[PDB]
Amino acid sequence: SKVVIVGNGPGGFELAKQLSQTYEVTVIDKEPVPYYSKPMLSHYIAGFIPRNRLFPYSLDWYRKRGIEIRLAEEAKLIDRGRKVVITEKGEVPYDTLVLATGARAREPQIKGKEYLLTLRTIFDADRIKESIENSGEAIIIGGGFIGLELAGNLAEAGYHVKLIHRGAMFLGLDEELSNMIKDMLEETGVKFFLNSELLEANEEGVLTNSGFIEGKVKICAIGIVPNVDLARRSGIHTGRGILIDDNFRTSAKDVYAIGDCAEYSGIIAGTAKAAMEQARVLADILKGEPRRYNFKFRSTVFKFGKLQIAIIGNTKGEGKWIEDNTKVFYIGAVVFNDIRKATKLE
Ligand SMILES: Cc1cc2nc3c(=O)[nH]c(=O)nc-3n(C[C@H](O)[C@H](O)[C@H](O)COP(=O)(O)OP(=O)(O)OC[C@H]3O[C@@H](n4cnc5c(N)ncnc54)[C@H](O)[C@@H]3O)c2cc1C
Structure with a gap:
């Protein structure tokens, strides 16, 4: 056959x-x-x-x-x-x-979309790599795993990273966990713009509701x-x-x-x-x-710079910390930097 x-x-x-x-x-x-x-x-x-x-x-x-x-x-x-x-x-x-x-x-449809890059293929990665090597910086618009991976790895390599995000939730997680992920990536060198919406892009940066963010390299990761x-x-x-x-x-x-x-x-x-x-x-x-x-x-584990995070099952309930690095839901779990504990909770 x-x-x-x-x-x-x-x-x-x-x-x-x-x-x-x-x-x-x-x-x-x-x-x-x-x-x-x-x-x-x-x-x-x-x-x-x-x-x-x-x-x-x-x-x-x-x-x-x-x-x-x-x-x-x-x-x-x-x-x-x-x-x-x-x-x-x-x-x-x-x-x-x-x-x-x-x-x-998903392609951006704003004024100045021609200044925004997306990431899907190895060929997109090559162009993004060469643009940050030219510029020394990137603005990332988004906040699912692709945007956070990118921002975390770039900051860890010592690039200037700015991340623009609507609202304050990441990876569909509750606001506490979302804030913790944010704090951990901030310490690494990611500069966050939360509750922020793109109005337009140009050569030298992006305009949001709350101001103008400087950067010639913009990467869109919105889905x-x-x-x-x-x-x-x-x-x-x-x-x-x-x-x-x-x-x-x-x-x-x-x-x-x-x-x-x-x-x-x-x-x-x-x-x-x-x-x-x-x-x-x-x-x-x-x-x-x-x-x-x-x-x-x-059930999946993402790695955002040094930060490893396991997201398992239903995290849409009310959660409780039962041990270090582990918030469980009563049907789900989020585990920071502990693969052993992630496997057993799954
Ligand atoms: C930057 C990045 C980071 C990611 N990180 C993670 C991660 O950490 N963890 C995780 O679980 N997932 C991650 N993903 C997602 C994961 O890569 C996708 O979920 C996965 O690629 C989907 O696999 P797929 O086989 O369905 O489709 P795809 O990877 O999209 O492949 C589809 C293929 O079909 C080909 N194709 C389409 N139409 C035709 C056609 N008409 N004729 C011939 N060929 C065609 C395309 O060329 C393509 O090669 C990441 C993705 C990106 C972009």
Whole structure:
């Protein structure tokens, strides 16, 4: 059976590894480079690792695994009729198609948006790296993991970092925890502008409700937009993401979707860890081992400079400190710099 996978992010890459010893697997990705770790891109940008350390396996490793890897190749249409994927280089037949098309950075729509950078690919990381090497500074607009990772790693490398954020909540956490994360990153050298909204950007900085912040390098990190256009124009139903059932099946026979592009009951997980877990569960399902991925539960650890933080389950309840570095909810936990305690609470 030919399994074709569009996308070689952590979703598609993990799926391919899990299926290649069993099926005839082809991966199609429009980027000209093999799989690289996105969670490590801030580390690269800040100068802590060489660009090559982002690449865990060479092209020969896809070879050794029996995975046909088609790079610098964009899928234009899915011919469900035939059943083939049409790229610009040609046509790729499938018995099973999995869409792992991921997401793009939400683009800013303000006056002066042409001065704002986003971060999604290694190529964005390269441009951001060269811009902060030219300037010695960055302004970050946002405050999910990408913005805080970036700001934390940049400050730790000794760049001037300014972070502009609406409201005062970070990572969807309560205001106490959000303030603690802020304080810890401040001590590291991050200058925060909370309760602050962008009105416009120009060459030399950004205007907010509460003033003008100087910086020629601005990076916007305000969210993602799932890539659903390939599906949409192939007659596959989409909402915010490609609409899947609890077995990752789309509205189209023989077409599945996983990762940042896939939406199940209003949820897109939005992490590499989730994307890889979905790939594993889908691999089990395709191999006739029924499995029920828990779409609700998230558990992930982020590293913002030296600060490691585990966020586990439901943190939307009322929380209580029971030990050093650990706030639990009564169903969830947040753990600062303690992987051991994070594992046992999960
Ligand atoms: C800076 C940064 C830091 C991050 N840090 C963390 C972290 O610390 N922890 C964490 O869990 N997650 C982190 N993430 C998120 C994680 O990287 C994403 O959740 C993950 O990348 C999603 O994986 P994916 O396989 O679904 O999609 P993607 O990584 O978006 O890959 C989709 C692939 O599909 C390809 N593609 C799309 N359409 C087509 C087409 N039509 N034809 C051919 N190819 C196509 C694209 O080129 C792309 O390679 C971070 C992300 C960024 C950007």
